[PDB]
Design an enzyme around this catalytic site. Structure first.
Site, mmCIF file in Angstrom:
data_model
loop_
_atom_site.group_PDB
_atom_site.id
_atom_site.type_symbol
_atom_site.label_atom_id
_atom_site.label_comp_id
_atom_site.label_asym_id
_atom_site.label_seq_id
_atom_site.Cartn_x
_atom_site.Cartn_y
_atom_site.Cartn_z
ATOM 1 N N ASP A 45 -0.420 14.473 -3.441
ATOM 2 C CA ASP A 45 -0.119 14.655 -2.043
ATOM 3 C C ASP A 45 -0.962 15.790 -1.560
ATOM 4 O O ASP A 45 -0.779 16.944 -1.982
ATOM 5 C CB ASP A 45 1.378 14.901 -1.863
ATOM 6 C CG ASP A 45 1.817 14.839 -0.368
ATOM 7 O OD1 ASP A 45 1.226 14.063 0.374
ATOM 8 O OD2 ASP A 45 2.753 15.581 -0.029
ATOM 9 N N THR A 46 -1.852 15.484 -0.636
ATOM 10 C CA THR A 46 -2.584 16.551 0.057
ATOM 11 C C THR A 46 -1.827 16.944 1.350
ATOM 12 O O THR A 46 -1.137 16.118 1.942
ATOM 13 C CB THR A 46 -4.048 16.109 0.435
ATOM 14 O OG1 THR A 46 -4.049 14.878 1.159
ATOM 15 C CG2 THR A 46 -4.991 15.924 -0.803
ATOM 16 N N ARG A 50 -1.652 -0.036 2.384
ATOM 17 C CA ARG A 50 -2.726 0.771 1.765
ATOM 18 C C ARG A 50 -2.844 0.415 0.297
ATOM 19 O O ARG A 50 -1.825 0.256 -0.389
ATOM 20 C CB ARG A 50 -2.458 2.304 1.890
ATOM 21 C CG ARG A 50 -2.331 2.732 3.345
ATOM 22 C CD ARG A 50 -2.057 4.224 3.445
ATOM 23 N NE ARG A 50 -0.765 4.562 2.826
ATOM 24 C CZ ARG A 50 -0.273 5.800 2.802
ATOM 25 N NH1 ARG A 50 -0.895 6.761 3.503
ATOM 26 N NH2 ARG A 50 0.851 6.071 2.122
ATOM 27 N N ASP A 81 -6.206 12.581 1.040
ATOM 28 C CA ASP A 81 -5.755 11.617 0.017
ATOM 29 C C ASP A 81 -5.832 10.159 0.502
ATOM 30 O O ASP A 81 -5.224 9.281 -0.123
ATOM 31 C CB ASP A 81 -4.343 11.994 -0.528
ATOM 32 C CG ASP A 81 -3.262 12.015 0.579
ATOM 33 O OD1 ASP A 81 -3.478 11.390 1.662
ATOM 34 O OD2 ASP A 81 -2.191 12.616 0.342
ATOM 35 N N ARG A 119 -4.822 4.826 -0.622
ATOM 36 C CA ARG A 119 -4.041 6.054 -0.736
ATOM 37 C C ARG A 119 -4.055 6.434 -2.211
ATOM 38 O O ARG A 119 -3.860 5.580 -3.090
ATOM 39 C CB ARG A 119 -2.578 5.740 -0.301
ATOM 40 C CG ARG A 119 -1.643 6.925 -0.525
ATOM 41 C CD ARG A 119 -2.073 8.186 0.221
ATOM 42 N NE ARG A 119 -0.954 9.175 0.303
ATOM 43 C CZ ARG A 119 -0.663 10.013 -0.689
ATOM 44 N NH1 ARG A 119 -1.436 10.025 -1.818
ATOM 45 N NH2 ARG A 119 0.315 10.922 -0.546
ATOM 46 N N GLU A 150 -1.254 17.425 5.271
ATOM 47 C CA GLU A 150 -1.814 16.701 6.431
ATOM 48 C C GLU A 150 -2.881 17.588 7.074
ATOM 49 O O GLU A 150 -2.884 18.830 6.875
ATOM 50 C CB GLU A 150 -0.715 16.338 7.433
ATOM 51 C CG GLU A 150 0.393 15.468 6.859
ATOM 52 C CD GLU A 150 -0.109 14.117 6.319
ATOM 53 O OE1 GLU A 150 -0.935 13.486 7.016
ATOM 54 O OE2 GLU A 150 0.321 13.682 5.187
HETATM 55 C C1 THP Z 1 1.197 7.743 -3.005
HETATM 56 C C2 THP Z 1 2.236 6.714 -2.586
HETATM 57 C C3 THP Z 1 2.843 6.782 -1.323
HETATM 58 N N1 THP Z 1 3.720 5.812 -0.959
HETATM 59 C C4 THP Z 1 4.460 5.888 0.329
HETATM 60 C C5 THP Z 1 5.686 6.784 0.167
HETATM 61 C C6 THP Z 1 5.796 7.486 1.504
HETATM 62 O O1 THP Z 1 6.635 6.713 2.407
HETATM 63 P P1 THP Z 1 7.057 7.417 3.792
HETATM 64 O O2 THP Z 1 5.904 7.195 4.723
HETATM 65 O O3 THP Z 1 8.264 6.600 4.117
HETATM 66 O O4 THP Z 1 7.290 8.892 3.606
HETATM 67 C C7 THP Z 1 4.361 7.536 2.020
HETATM 68 C C8 THP Z 1 3.651 8.874 1.751
HETATM 69 O O5 THP Z 1 2.264 8.752 2.100
HETATM 70 P P2 THP Z 1 1.441 9.899 2.853
HETATM 71 O O6 THP Z 1 1.588 11.137 1.990
HETATM 72 O O7 THP Z 1 0.078 9.339 3.010
HETATM 73 O O8 THP Z 1 2.163 10.109 4.175
HETATM 74 O O9 THP Z 1 3.665 6.536 1.282
HETATM 75 C C9 THP Z 1 4.098 4.799 -1.869
HETATM 76 O O10 THP Z 1 4.985 3.970 -1.514
HETATM 77 N N2 THP Z 1 3.587 4.731 -3.123
HETATM 78 C C10 THP Z 1 2.648 5.631 -3.499
HETATM 79 O O11 THP Z 1 2.236 5.571 -4.647
HETATM 80 CA CA CA Z 2 -0.474 13.423 2.468
#
Ligand code: THP
Ligand code: CA
Length: 129
Positions: free
Chosen positions: A34-35, A75, A15, A29, A37
């Site tokens: 959510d994919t 991102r 993702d 992103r 890891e």
């Molecule tokens: C998809 C997405 C993720 N994020 C943030 C929330 C999560 O914070 P935390 O890192 O504090 O968990 C993290 C999840 O991304 P990943 O799934 O790439 O890890 O990215 C956003 O803020 N907005 C979004 O739309």
């Molecule tokens: Ca992910």
């Protein structure tokens, strides 16, 4: 919402895709998904599926939603299209991503993706197997 040009730099995982957008490198992103890891179950299959899809495309585009365009990590938050097909929806339709991280005002394609997830889950595909 509007599709904009970008060019692939590197597929990172299921993702996350690095692209050049308005002439600058940016990690994107994918909204609303959510994919797993890379190190989790289906994580390698999700990374592979996104990779093939963006690498094989002649045309990559990004589409921002109505709210925040970058997250707290810098991102880009967008829907990604590969030859007109949305990668976000495709991952969900194949059971390689769950609909997730649905925040108000960046959720234009929520119901489209939930519909894809329902059908993946009905088919018991991948994550839903
Ligand atoms: C998809 C997405 C993720 N994020 C943030 C929330 C999560 O914070 P935390 O890192 O504090 O968990 C993290 C999840 O991304 P990943 O799934 O790439 O890890 O990215 C956003 O803020 N907005 C979004 O739309
Ligand atoms: Ca992910």
């Amino acid at each position: 919402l509007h599709k904009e040009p970008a060019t692939l730099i590197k597929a990172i995982d299921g993702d996350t895709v690095k692209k050049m957008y308005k002439g600058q490198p940016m990690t994107f992103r994918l909204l609303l998904v959510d994919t797993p890891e890379f190190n989790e179950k289906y994580g390698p299959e999700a990374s592979a599926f996104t990779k093939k899809m963006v690498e094989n495309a002649k045309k990559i585009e990004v589409e921002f939603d109505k709210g925040q365009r970058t997250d707290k990590y810098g991102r880009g938050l967008a829907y990604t299209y590969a030859d007109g097909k949305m990668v976000n929806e495709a991952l969900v339709r194949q059971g390689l991503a769950k609909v997730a991280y649905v925040y108000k005002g960046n959720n234009t394609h929520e119901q489209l993706l939930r519909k894809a997830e329902a059908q993946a889950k009905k088919e018991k595909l991948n994550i839903w197997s």
